[PDB]
Chain length 253, copies 4
């Protein structure tokens, strides 16, 4: 028997097989979880991608900017898992920031519409997804979104850092809401995962700072962590952040 | 001599004489600073308010959602303080969240359009004001914005809390940029001011919500040369409350 | 199959069946783990308590102030689980502060001798237990100690709070060392357990002080292979309370 | 007129002219502060050291392990500043950890008696000094101790890191006590100050991470910060930590 046996879990954020949500999905199904999956735009592609998953799973469309997608999302899931059934888990692995706000572009050159669009997608959508889905979730359930420690500024990450700080603050509020349904809300703050010279420097220090090391080619440790929060072995943790970063954020040098 | 003697400081955010920015300006002027002041919509009203300060100061219009007010800010400021002169301090004391994402409204019912507008005015504008004014600031200078500790979730504050968390993240990126200019960037996270009961109890030294002067003082401390090694950071002017659980 | 199936786990700190360590052990045994258990002074009494667990387990004496109990611990553990075998988990659920530095006594009136003894038993022993048992642990293993969030000051807890702050600092240094062994080291910061009212109110999911099982579960989660990328860290088993201000 | 005019301030922790407390003393006197100074053992040396200070100041003996020194400390200060006078400021710049617990020695090889002695001197003494001195302090007053950010483990620092975490937790409690007298208690978390290859790496990254840079040969920025807290321009901050580290702790890379 597996970690997530009989639990019905919605996973968003699969675009390729390198996506963190592919591995979360992969590992959740390995542990006996019944998935519903959502995707944004390139649906034809992600049909073939999610076929490379261990088990079959209905695939729905969900642009988190789209207001019709959100209002219909409860009924579409319910149809997909069968009326009378409910979700025990929800995975948010969605994030986007335009290259105007992340990377080489100077922090001060990002226009607000672009920053606004990235904050919409990477932080606010955690609330509106929880809002869509909370009415069709069982007590004991668990919502989990993906994070990248924003405690300190770093190069490149720029406005995506700022989006992740907003996400964290959003997580604490969603938990207030989720808790009235007896449902937990947490973030997994992951280390860098391989989905210019400066960026190599960060990733390098990550493995060096990590007391147990950090392999950027391996997404499984993060998938596992998420399934831990989706399981029942972490039942008194909510509003919170769990770090799957090799322990790097706990070490200065 | 005064704490800010001979320093030129931009003070944004006066709308009333209850405004934190008003007391900051008042104290900065009490301590010898030369101010330039900015105002949003009600210019005539705050002209009447800004006439209540100890000393006179130029009043520029600044709506931080307005791209033309931003790209022209440097030039307008220069004209006020005189060419060749640069600012030594900038006060961001601007916030706004529509009532749809702050108050009695449930946290899930705030439209993005409204939360995006609040985050624009409360967070992103700390960066775009720095962007504008950094070219016209002196080495050793200081940019300070107003904060309310968002490390934990709380009733009512809702998406403004989310705004403040973003500001804190922005402040750390603004100090990256500011440092290229020899300039500092810090936040004062202040207790609740009457522009709560738990706040005063928790505060080891106590907390008066009817007094903004202790907060104004902490801002001025940051605008001076007595905290020259702190940037990207947050000074808590809160009676100590956030250091205490109960 | 069980969560800890086939894993050998040291559980320290049982003195009663109200002890957090008792429920941890009970749950680890419910989930298929093989235990070795340690006890301080009252060995016969906890023999009687440890007979109340689902499955039987060897009971070693361990006073962490005793240097001879430490240097002999590895050898004694090996003898219990059989040579060639190594532990996969270690539970530090030991704390003590004399009443002179925890309770009604004022914070300034605790002698150092008493605070030093409490910090010895509550903090430094997390390191010396790791020091002892690291040589006899398998790669992929996990060391977990018990914590109570000390990030803010609070009445009564006093110098035990200071102990817990030191533990947290020690845990981060223990994970440095543990990592050389492919082993993890983390703290569970738990809510108040009946071995407060504010705690349940703040907890978004609620907090039952009469139930230690949700905390025991979180410990077991850390002893398993489902959090393999977390070390030097703190998991809060507190109903979410510490994420909420009011 | 200066920052600290008419304020009577006790400064501990001068052993040489490179000490952070020499500069705190130096800068406090420059700003019109009336000092009382304490020292540990080598009193003859620190008499000549403190002569190189701008202004004269009574010099008392204070071993913070010594229980007689502490119980007599209020009366000795009072004699030194004149009966009826009181202290407006107190500076704790004391720290020690034996080399068994700090540097090359493996973390696990430090014996508790040594760690216990370093924790006594670097953390517990902040309480017992506040205890000695609080009865002879004016409302509006300020106690300030020296800190080195312990949020994360780093090499070398080892058990001194642990001592500083204890200090921080102690600061939050002293503020509870100090507040009944209307006196603030804060820490200045300073960057590294020049008072093997690995240690050079830390100091280097400090200046690199510091958005405004960090000069390890210059103690004045830290002295200034302390005088800020000793002044009246930070009157609603207590139980707290101020970082004079160039902004380095706010930056990952
Ligand atoms: N990649 C890393 O190093 C790592 C580390 C920490 C955190 N994270 C976070 O994990 C999450 C997924 O990361 P990833 O590396 O797997 O990225 P990915 O590019 O593989 O996946 C991101 C997903 O966001 C989806 N998306 C974008 N806009 C959307 C919209 N408008 N509506 C619905 N979906 C939308 C995309 O379709 C995509 O599947 C992100 O939130 C990311 O910030 C990743
Ligand atoms: N009052 C409190 O308890 C408290 C506590 C902590 C932090 N703060 C912060 O202090 C700052 C000022 O708050 P205050 O209490 O003086 O409130 P206030 O209402 O008096 O000031 C807010 C100011 O922001 C200005 N503003 C709004 N939209 C603007 C725009 N688009 N462009 C330019 N200016 C705009 C307003 O005109 C006003 O002067 C804010 O950042 C607020 O978040 C307040
Ligand atoms: N009860 C709570 O609300 C709570 C909350 C958070 C954290 N904790 C932590 O959980 C851990 C265990 O607490 P508990 O509530 O089960 O209390 P408990 O009194 O049942 O357990 C404390 C244990 O420490 C042992 N101990 C004391 N001195 C020792 C020594 N010198 N050598 C070896 N063992 C020694 C005792 O024998 C006892 O079994 C402690 O670390 C405590 O700080 C407790
Ligand atoms: N040096 C740095 O890079 C730096 C950075 C951060 C924090 N700090 C802290 O600042 C403080 C002073 O540091 P420094 O670099 O000036 O060191 P320093 O060696 O020059 O001064 C340390 C002082 O502690 C005193 N002392 C030791 N044991 C004592 C005792 N038993 N009783 C009374 N006094 C005793 C010594 O006499 C000495 O004057 C320390 O707490 C240190 O940890 C220093
Ligand atoms: O958060 C992240 C952190 C890292 Cl180190 C790498 C990738 C991350 O995730 C993203 C960043 C930007 C955009 Cl547009 C989309 C995604 Cl999915
Ligand atoms: O941050 C704040 C904290 C508190 Cl206790 C009270 C008011 C605050 O600030 C605001 C809240 C909403 C809007 Cl529309 C404008 C401002 Cl200035
Ligand atoms: O950490 C704790 C937190 C709480 Cl709410 C209650 C008890 C705790 O733990 C202790 C306190 C004092 C002693 Cl002598 C022994 C232990 Cl185990
Ligand atoms: O805290 C410190 C931090 C740094 Cl980077 C350098 C020195 C420090 O201070 C000390 C460390 C050990 C001992 Cl025995 C005495 C003192 Cl004064």
């Amino acid at each position: 028997t597996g970690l997530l046996d009989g639990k019905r879990i919605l996973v968003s954020g699969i675009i390729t097989d390198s996506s963190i949500a592919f591995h979360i999905a992969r590992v959740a199904q390995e542990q006996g979880a019944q998935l519903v999956l959502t995707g944004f735009d390139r649906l034809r592609l992600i049909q073939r991608i999610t076929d490379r998953l261990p088990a079959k799973a209905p695939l729905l469309e969900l642009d988190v900017q789209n207001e019709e997608h959100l209002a219909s999302l409860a009924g579409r899931v319910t149809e997909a898992i069968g009326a009378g059934n409910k979700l025990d888990g929800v995975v948010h692995s969605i994030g986007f920031m335009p290259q105007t706000g992340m990377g080489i572009n100077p922090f001060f050159d990002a226009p607000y519409a672009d920053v606004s669009k990235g904050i919409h997608i990477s932080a606010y959508s955690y609330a509106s997804m929880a809002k869509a889905l909370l009415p069709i979730m069982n007590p004991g359930g668990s919502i989990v979104g993906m994070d990248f420690d924003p405690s300190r500024a770093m190069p490149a990450y720029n406005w995506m850092t700022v989006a992740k700080s907003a996400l964290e603050s959003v997580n604490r509020f969603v938990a207030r809401e989720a808790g009235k349904y007896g449902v937990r809300s947490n973030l997994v703050a992951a280390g860098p995962i391989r989905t210019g010279a400066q960026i190599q420097l960060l990733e390098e220090g990550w493995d060096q700072r990590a007391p147990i090391g950090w392999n950027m080619k391996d997404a499984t440790p993060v998938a596992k962590t998420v399934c831990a929060l989706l399981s029942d072995w972490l039942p008194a943790t909510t509003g919170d952040i769990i770090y799957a970063d090799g322990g790097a954020h706990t070490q200065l040098l």
